[PDB]
Amino acid sequence: KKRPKRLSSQNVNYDLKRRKIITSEGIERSFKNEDFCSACNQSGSFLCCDTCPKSFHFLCLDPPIDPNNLPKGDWHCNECKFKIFINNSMATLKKIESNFIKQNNNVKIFAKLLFNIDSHNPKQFQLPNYIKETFPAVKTGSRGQYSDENDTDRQITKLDSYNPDTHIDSNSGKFLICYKCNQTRLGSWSHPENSRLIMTCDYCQTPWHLDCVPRASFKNLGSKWKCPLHSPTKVYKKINYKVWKKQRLINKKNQLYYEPLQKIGYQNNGNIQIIPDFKITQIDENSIKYDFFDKIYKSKMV
Amino acid sequence: LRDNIQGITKPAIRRLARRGGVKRISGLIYEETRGVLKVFLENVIRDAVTYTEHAKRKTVTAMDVVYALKRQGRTLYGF
Amino acid sequence: LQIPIKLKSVLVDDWEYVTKDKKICRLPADVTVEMVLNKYEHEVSQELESPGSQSQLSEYCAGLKLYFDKCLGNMLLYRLERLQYDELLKKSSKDQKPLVPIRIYGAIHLLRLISVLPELISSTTMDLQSCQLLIKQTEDFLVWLLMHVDEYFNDKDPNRSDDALYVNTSSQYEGVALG
Amino acid sequence: RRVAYFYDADVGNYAYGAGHPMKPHRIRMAHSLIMNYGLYKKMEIYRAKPATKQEMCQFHTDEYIDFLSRVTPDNLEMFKRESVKFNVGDDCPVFDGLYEYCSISGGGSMEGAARLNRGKCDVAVNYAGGLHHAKKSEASGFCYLNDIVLGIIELLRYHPRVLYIDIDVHHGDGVEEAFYTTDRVMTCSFHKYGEFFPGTGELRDIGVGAGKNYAVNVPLRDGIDDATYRSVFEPVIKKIMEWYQPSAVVLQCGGDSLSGDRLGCFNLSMEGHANCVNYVKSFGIPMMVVGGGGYTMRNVARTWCFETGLLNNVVLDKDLPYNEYYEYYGPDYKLSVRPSNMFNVNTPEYLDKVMTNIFANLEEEDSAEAKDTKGGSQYARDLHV
Amino acid sequence: RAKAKTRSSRAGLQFPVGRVHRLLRKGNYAERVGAGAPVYLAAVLEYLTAEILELAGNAARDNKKTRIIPRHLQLAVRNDEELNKLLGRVTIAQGGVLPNIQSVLLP
Amino acid sequence: NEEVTFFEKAKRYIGNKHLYTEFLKILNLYSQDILDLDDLVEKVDFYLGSNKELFTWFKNFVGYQAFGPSYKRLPKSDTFMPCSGRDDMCWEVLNDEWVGHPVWASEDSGFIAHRKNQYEETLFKIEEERHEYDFYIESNLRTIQCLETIVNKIENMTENEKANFKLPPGLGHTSMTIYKKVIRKVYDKERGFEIIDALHEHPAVTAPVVLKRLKQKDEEWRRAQREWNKVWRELEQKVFFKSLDHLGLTFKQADKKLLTTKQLISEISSIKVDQTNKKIHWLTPKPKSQLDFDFPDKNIFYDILCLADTFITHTTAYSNPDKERLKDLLKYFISLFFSISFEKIEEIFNLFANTNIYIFFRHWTTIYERLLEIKQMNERVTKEINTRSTVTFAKDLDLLSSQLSEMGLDFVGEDAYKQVLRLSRRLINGDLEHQWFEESLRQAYNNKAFKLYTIDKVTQSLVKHAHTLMTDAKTAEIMALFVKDRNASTTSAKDQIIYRLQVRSHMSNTENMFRIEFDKRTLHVSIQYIALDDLT
Amino acid sequence: KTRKESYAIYVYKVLKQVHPDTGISSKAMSIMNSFVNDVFERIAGEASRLAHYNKRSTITSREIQTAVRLLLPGELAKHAVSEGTKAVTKYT
């Protein structure tokens, strides 16, 4: 059992490998004794160039060519072919795009902005630095998607072992209390079936049980789980419609703005904040009582 | 501008080695000298760029170069 | 550039539709460059002076069309987004008709184009005096887009009505796109 | 009652991939547990029909079949474009025999559906198929061709209403996504909602349009025993059989739900897996049974033999008959294996809530294919050695 | 007052922000010290510590050792090119050197 | 009737400030006239679902008295995807609009496979080895019978048809892939195409040699498969039951960390603070508590002691009189707590005490409930060990002769309880190996009794929780006070308060006091972690 | 006797976060403590001379970022300041 050499098929092939001895002796008589895409930031079908070590995907090309038939000549690059085609060409000893302006008809506002896209590499949309720093809550991802509610290399639990964890707080030790049920229901070690799984929130640390809300999995390996007690990203109404796609968080030079309006009968399409277009006023509890009084007065006419 | 590693002149490298007391110079010395000068220059220039970008400045002063040389233990006087 | 905060929110929502929700805008777009450039042609002549900047605005629109024709596959058009660019040529290679993106692409691609222009003007010797009115015209475009946010840019979803200028991507187009 | 088995000689003669979890070894050796016991007294054996290009193509697209009928590992380089867009890349390895295995599996599925349609056979069981994780044009969940939806549209010719019960294999979704806006097809699946490779769906998926409140889905956690499986299976099935007036069952047995698998941990023994078909066989509604997966061929062959013995309304003995694959199973030599030591995580408060809100929301080419060559030459009677 | 919460937990860090701030203030490096400087320093130290300990564990995994010894730390430091460049003038006790033999020495 | 007090009542109910801001945002979102009735009722059911009186109070003003995150609709532009053979009603029942993706539910997180440890890994490795070798040999024998079928039909009569026997691909069968597959398997990378082409275009010539290169290969494969199956069955004899265990293998490391006092005090304090809240200003907290323990029989109070003495005679760490004094004190708690004078060894009364005796008693009922679970399946195991025996088809190569648990470790011929207690005593005495006990326990049972895998460990803790029971001054003092107050007849609310105030003022406030209420009615025992109404 | 400042528990919880089943000996842990102290001293000195260069009496996170870009070469600094960036993004 401890010697897999002779016990296995050593004469013919191996445990699974194909030894050469089938090809060596085959009793035959019928022969009668004689790279990486900087503009893609992904991985897949790469295509390089004969002049530069850079590579691009087969799909991001400006001429759409099907991947089952590669272009001939190993696809000389956009830079090299456009520097041997239009850029470095006749009428030397001067700047090439100076004579471009004299070749334009009925267009003058783009003096030199049409020659560059003629002789530049393919490139997908990458977010500008000022736009991505304009929203600090918006950040790039692993290869560069949008990542706000999602979620080093630089070149498990089966029994009642995790349920005792995440019950004693790491900071204070106080028991986190569930909302819908007033019992945390840790369970018994003598009877494991009394143990109940509880969850946590990555935003406001709200406790939630697995029985109050329907969950079965753990959304913690690539997407932050949001408890069903916050403002939704979009609402849906049925009575052509408005979904209220939040308003996003602006932070540059504190551009969120903070001023109390009358806060009632204002119709600011949501967009409120609590203190004890793109206009947001503060909300206190007094205006909450005011506009609920207005709402239940206008709702019940009889 | 895009290809300027040839701006370092081979007889200039010869003069630099003559200042160092070199009697005989091989032909493969020049390329390695250009490479080591390029990597040292880009290290010091990166340090000076970081120094002048901490101060919200777009021009590199001589004091930035002096402090960059002091960071690597190659402090130069006169500036 | 003074991009409006609402318009910045619209652009970030466009990025989140392209990347996370992973949806693709309609090839027969309801809105395109005609109902903005022709709107400028027949709109600015009723409240401003007849001579002066009218001809320069017209040639600016012509230059924007000529730039949008040859810039669609270069400065715009995300990795997922380029898929609809391919078969449009495949239809064009058999129907004996050249393809232009002038009549077929919406205003969000105009937003993308006017958002990628600051990072390429510094590559060449851009003349500031001849282009100051160009940043002025682009900021006119941002304030005009800040004016019209309801009847042009819709926030709807294709789950219940197909009038949101944005439809989902199936696993067929995911497989042939993200390969 | 009358039951029929569909089996081909070269149905286990394939190779799905070297070391890949799902295997084609499960079906053929299962037939070795059919004739060796003596179960052929009620077995109507029909060989799987070699379906052609356009005969089965009423569900999947033309280019999909044109790819799988002209792909070999020898010429994978010139077909690399369709390998990455049809989900036949690293998820599904490319081997010779894809088209023929898919054709015989689809032929067996159509034969079972048509034999249910005539009513000559009360129950049409077939383990040669069982591939349902695929969609209209993709091959996800280690399955290439969806072999249940063609059965659905085959029984839709006569039976206006069908009942699809999906025992957990790999969180199947093709049958659910194929019919979502139609009230004539009812889909349900008891499964595990987790971070699986093909896992889609949610409890909130109830149906839209005309198919509203007819596409229910019951999610469970990682690890459920037989008693809790019965307690969660009984009330929802009783409620939907009360409120639909059923006509046909296309329930699919779970191959990956047994104790011990490469992916998925579900604690059902032979009794727990048998009660799912016992509850729906107590009604007497005619039924066609689809086969399952199974990352371990021995356990899935044992539960398939137990299922085939159970459809004869008899209890097969707790001993396996001798065959050419007699040494595959465990040293106990018993058909009923013991359940694994999985902790019971499914608290019945969540199950009661699922029952409560489920009760709340619920209140060409010779088509109809029943032609294939007769078997009987696939004799699995070897001698002891 | 209120419940005491450390600044490391607010910033998602394990290294102490307050201890780094104390050593910065008592270390007479500057007259005034910003709030984000101890957080940034703690993050940098935590990242460097995690990278070095992960490299040491990787170098000790094939050595059948489940504990970090100074030889493992020396191997992790000198094996990485950027760690060798940063710790160019750094001597590690009880670590020795890398076990490399030149090609001319081997017959 | 009024609505102005509901807001402060809800503010007191929620408690947390930021959750109150979130509730305010949700209620304002409802107030600004875009939210339907379903959204507001489904949000109130989560915000204020703990109480139904305030819910029904809210419903008198307003209220009633589609799909999830996946399955998103596709437009009617890409549906014209021309699928041949589509019938009239095929478009009616099949819709391409609603499709679902795994990456849509994953939300850019990849896919993670649920893999086990190395035992299941090597089990799956040898399982796929078995699959590949069995598929190879069955394809080989199928090709033997296929090539033997098509030789007698053209070898019998004449020879002109031998030279010209042109056939379409398929070899006269419904199969279309298998024979080329095995020619590719048994030949080179470039040869197999021209061997199968010759075969196709010229049979009855290369057929005898392709049978010659397939018969002796089949017989060598059969012999190597027989020896492979021998070593394979020798492997399954150890790894069949080990692959069925996922929590008992980690139970050795688990029992070292969940048997501490901190885990148990956190456990009881969990239900203590579950009982503490939502019981003020409208209800009175009962003196009786939860976490009760039931003792159905009394024979389990002695048999574990047959191990316990067997431990301390085996352990050389303790001195000479330590063993006899431990036995004396343990017989003392046998005598006074259960009110039993003496019984043969088998092979409302309330007490106030502290943490160490509490966790000792907790592991006492843990072992008691482990043995209660063991005796719960004792009848069914003693029923079907008798049906468990070797078959008559396994005598070819002497299966079940690996000497795993045939030394008397099986449950045949005796009761399972007595045999497992004897096996645990053999573990205690050191005659039996630990892994041999683990294999015997996982073989004789259905892998349900995972709790007894570290029993010696826990009874070590037991004697430790006895050895420290009469070591320090404080626990010995309270034990002497309990013995002096033990008259086997205590009346409630008569003399227990004097003892409570005498024992509360002697210890400090750091060590909390717990109480045990035991009565003779079905041997009921309740444990309360009382913290209030004791210092007043 | 007297209390001594050390980086024991912090380095240990970082190690347990990145390697749950790998320990460390006393000598190597002293090496790691001295490494942390030396990198702290180097970054503090670089930030101090940066602040003295600009006549700045305040050392903020920008000084630490500049010091990490200066002393640490290659991309190893960059991820580090990226970590510092999200540290600030978690602090604010």
UniProtKB/Swiss-Prot annotation, chain A:
Zinc finger (PHD-type): 35-83, 175-233
Localization, UniProt: Nucleus
Domain of life per record: Eukaryota
Function: Catalytic component of the RPD3C(S) histone deacetylase complex responsible for the deacetylation of lysine residues on the N-terminal part of the core histones (H2A, H2B, H3 and H4). Histone deacetylation gives a tag for epigenetic repression and plays an important role in transcriptional regulation, cell cycle progression, DNA damage response, osmotic stress response and developmental events.
Subunit structure: Component of the RPD3C(S) complex composed of at least EAF3, RCO1, RPD3, SIN3, and UME1.
Additional remarks: Present with 486 molecules/cell in log phase SD medium.
Name of the protein: Transcriptional regulatory protein RCO1
Species for this entry: Saccharomyces cerevisiae (strain ATCC 204508 / S288c)
Curated annotation (Swiss-Prot), chain C:
Domain of life per record: Eukaryota
Domain MRG: 1-178
Subcellular location: Nucleus
Family note: Belongs to the MRG family.
Self-association and partners: Component of the NuA4 histone acetyltransferase complex composed of at least ACT1, ARP4, YAF9, VID21, SWC4, EAF3, EAF5, EAF6, EAF7, EPL1, ESA1, TRA1 and YNG2.
Function: Component of the NuA4 histone acetyltransferase complex which is involved in transcriptional activation of selected genes principally by acetylation of nucleosomal histone H4 and H2A. The NuA4 complex is also involved in DNA repair.
Note: Present with 1890 molecules/cell in log phase SD medium.
Protein name: Chromatin modification-related protein EAF3
Organism: Saccharomyces cerevisiae (strain ATCC 204508 / S288c)
Encoding gene per record: EAF3
Included stretch of the parent chain: 222 to 400 of 401
Curated annotation (Swiss-Prot), chain D:
InterPro entries linked to this entry: HDAC_PDAC, His_deacetylse, His_deacetylse_1, His_deacetylse_dom, His_deacetylse_dom_sf, Ureohydrolase_dom_sf
UniProt short sequence motif ESA1-RPD3 motif, positions renumbered to this chain: 302-322
Reactions catalysed according to its record: N(6)-acetyl-L-lysyl-[histone] + H2O = L-lysyl-[histone] + acetate
Outcome reported for the amino acid change (mutating V314A): Strongly reduces HDAC activity
EC primary class: hydrolase
UniProt-annotated location(s): Cytoplasm; Nucleus
GO BP term (any one): transcription elongation by RNA polymerase II
UniProt modified residues of type Phosphoserine: S367
Family (UniProt): Belongs to the histone deacetylase family. HD type 1 subfamily.
Name the record gives this protein: Histone deacetylase RPD3
From Swiss-Prot, chain G:
GO-annotated cellular components: nucleosome; nucleus
Subunit relationships: The nucleosome is a histone octamer containing two molecules each of H2A, H2B, H3 and H4 assembled in one H3-H4 heterotetramer and two H2A-H2B heterodimers. The octamer wraps approximately 147 bp of DNA.
Homology family: Belongs to the histone H2B family.
GO molecular function: DNA binding; protein heterodimerization activity; structural constituent of chromatin
Included stretch of the parent chain: 32 to 123 of 126
Post-translational modification: Monoubiquitination of Lys-90 by BRE1 gives a specific tag for epigenetic transcriptional activation and is also prerequisite for histone H3 'Lys-4' and 'Lys-79' methylation.
Keyword Phosphoprotein carried by entry: yes
Domain of life of the source: Eukaryota
Function: Core component of nucleosome. Nucleosomes wrap and compact DNA into chromatin, limiting DNA accessibility to the cellular machineries which require DNA as a template. Histones thereby play a central role in transcription regulation, DNA repair, DNA replication and chromosomal stability. DNA accessibility is regulated via a complex set of post-translational modifications of histones, also called histone code, and nucleosome remodeling.
Main location: nucleus
Glycyl lysine isopeptide (Lys-Gly) (interchain with G-Cter in ubiquitin) cross-link site: K90
Keywords of this entry: Acetylation, Chromosome, DNA-binding, Glycoprotein, Isopeptide bond, Nucleosome core, Nucleus, Phosphoprotein, Ubl conjugation
The name this protein goes by in its record: Histone H2B 1.1
Glycosylation sites: S82
Phylogenetic lineage: Eukaryota, Metazoa, Chordata, Craniata, Vertebrata
Organism: Xenopus laevis (African clawed frog)
Localization, UniProt: Nucleus; Chromosome
Keyword Glycoprotein: yes
